[PDB]
Amino acid sequence: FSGPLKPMTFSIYEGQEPSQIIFQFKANPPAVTFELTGETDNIFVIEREGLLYYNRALDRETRSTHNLQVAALDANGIIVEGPVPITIEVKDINDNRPTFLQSKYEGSVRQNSRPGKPFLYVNATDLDDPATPNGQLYYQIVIQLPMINNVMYFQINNKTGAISLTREGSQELNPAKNPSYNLVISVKDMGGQSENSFSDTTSVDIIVT
Amino acid sequence: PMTFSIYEGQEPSQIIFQFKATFELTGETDNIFVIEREGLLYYNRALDRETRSTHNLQVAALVEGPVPITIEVKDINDNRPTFLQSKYEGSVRQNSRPGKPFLYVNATDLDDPATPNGQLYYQIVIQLPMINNVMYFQINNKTGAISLTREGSQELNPAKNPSYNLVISVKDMGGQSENSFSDTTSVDIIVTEN
Numbered sequence: 001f002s003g004p005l006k007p008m009t010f011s012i013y014e015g016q017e018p019s020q021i022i023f024q025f026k027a028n029p030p031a032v033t034f035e036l037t038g039e040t041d042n043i044f045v046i047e048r049e050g051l052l053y054y055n056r057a058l059d060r061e062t063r064s065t066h067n068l069q070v071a072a073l074d075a076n077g078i079i080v081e082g083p084v085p086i087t088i089e090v091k092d093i094n095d096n097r098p099t100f101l102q103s104k105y106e107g108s109v110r111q112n113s114r115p116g117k118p119f120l121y122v123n124a125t126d127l128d129d130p131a132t133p134n135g136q137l138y139y140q141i142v143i144q145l146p147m148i149n150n151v152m153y154f155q156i157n158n159k160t161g162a163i164s165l166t167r168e169g170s171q172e173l174n175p176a177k178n179p180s181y182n183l184v185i186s187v188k189d190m191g192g193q194s195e196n197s198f199s200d201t202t203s204v205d206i207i208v209t
Numbered sequence: 210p211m212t213f214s215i216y217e218g219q220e221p222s223q224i225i226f227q228f229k230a231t232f233e234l235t236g237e238t239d240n241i242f243v244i245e246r247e248g249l250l251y252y253n254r255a256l257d258r259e260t261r262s263t264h265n266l267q268v269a270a271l272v273e274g275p276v277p278i279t280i281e282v283k284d285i286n287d288n289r290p291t292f293l294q295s296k297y298e299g300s301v302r303q304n305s306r307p308g309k310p311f312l313y314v315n316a317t318d319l320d321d322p323a324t325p326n327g328q329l330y331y332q333i334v335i336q337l338p339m340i341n342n343v344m345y346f347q348i349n350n351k352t353g354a355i356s357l358t359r360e361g362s363q364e365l366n367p368a369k370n371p372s373y374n375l376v377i378s379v380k381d382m383g384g385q386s387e388n389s390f391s392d393t394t395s396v397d398i399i400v401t402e403n
């Protein structure tokens with residue numbers, strides 16, 4: 001938990017209240033005191049003894065990296081050593097629900113449209129880290145109304161939110177029989193893979209032409 | 210003490226983690242997980258959730274550990290759902306209440322049932338005989354509970370036709386086409402008198 005002044009990177013989970021110092025910098029005479037600059041945000045502090053710490057739980061969605069610099073000073077306040085870059089990587093936790101860009105979508109599809117060919121897109125946004133499951137979204141049709149004998153007329157690309165006819169929907173959609181369908185779409189984060197995830201829903205009304 | 214979540218059925222394309230200190234790895238390594246002498250931790254071929262879903266590893270410094278390193282093996286759809294029977298023999302009373310089950314068909318899926326990979330969707334593929342394209346039978350697409358329709362309750366008549374065959378399908382990925390496996394099974398149903 002101590003060592004020379006040099007470029008270093010520390011990884012700290014957002015939402016963790018501090019319990020111990022991050023690091024102690026040691027610098028031989030003529031290193032008197034230490035100075036901390038950069039994206040301190042009144043969170044990151046260095047003491048005279050070279051003790052580096054953070055004073056409150058971070059939030060990746062306020063700042064996802066804190067670019068700091070540490071320098072060793074002498075008696076006259078004059079830089080002796082560094083300034084060196086000290087990087088804080090604020091590790092993501094799943095603390096944001098995914099939200100649909102619309103609570104209601106209005107679409108239309110032609111009667112004999114190709115199966116798999118998109119005619120509408122639903123999208124959601126998640127403020128968590130997209131390089132992690134926390135920010136990786138999975139789209140599902142949860143309801144089709146009306147639905148005949150459990151045959152799905154519509155399918156959604158689970159990654160992209162692209163809504164297209166199924167094989168059966170291509171074959172069966174007939175505006176005279178039924179001019180419109182309502183889909184309820186879910187989105188989950190954690191890539192749709194957990195129970196331990198957040199979810200949103202939207203409604204899509206679709207006219208058959 | 211760290212957790213890493215690695216999909217099964219992927220050839221390693223990245224290291225798991227570089228520890229900064231000599232390191233020893235112990236625990237459920239299964240000659241797949243390796244740590245270099247200087248703490249580069251990595252896996253040397255594709256995991257299989259259905260062989261081992263968590264790998265409980267320990268990393269020690271040589272003094273500092275051992276620490277539990279947990280590998281959560283994330284599921285992919287690599288198992289077809291299967292019915293518990295290839296043939297079911299059912300019986301339903303004439304005028305039985307619509308929607309009241311009289312038979313269950315079941316499937317199991319070796320993939321994770323907390324994911325779409327293990328999430329099954331039951332359908333009636335075909336009712337024989339069928340009159341005028343009217344379904345006498347319905348199935349609960351979550352449970353595989355088979356019951357009469359309103360039409361079936363009103364029409365089934367063992368004097369006119371005492372037996373029907375259903376072909377039932379089960380799909381995983383919650384029954385959507387793309388990336389899903391499927392099984393089918395036969396149900397013979399006798400209609401008894403009221």
Ligand SMILES: [Ca+2]
Pocket residue numbers: 014059060061062095
């Ligand atoms: Ca946050």
Ligand SMILES: [Ca+2]
Pocket residue numbers: 094095096097098126127128134135189190198
């Ligand atoms: Ca999220």
Ligand SMILES: [Ca+2]
Pocket residue numbers: 014060061092093094095096127128129134
């Ligand atoms: Ca977050």
Ligand SMILES: [Ca+2]
Pocket residue numbers: 217256257258259260287
């Ligand atoms: Ca497997």
Ligand SMILES: [Ca+2]
Pocket residue numbers: 286287288289290318319320326327381382390
């Ligand atoms: Ca499966």
Ligand SMILES: [Ca+2]
Pocket residue numbers: 217258259284285286287288319320321326
């Ligand atoms: Ca699997």
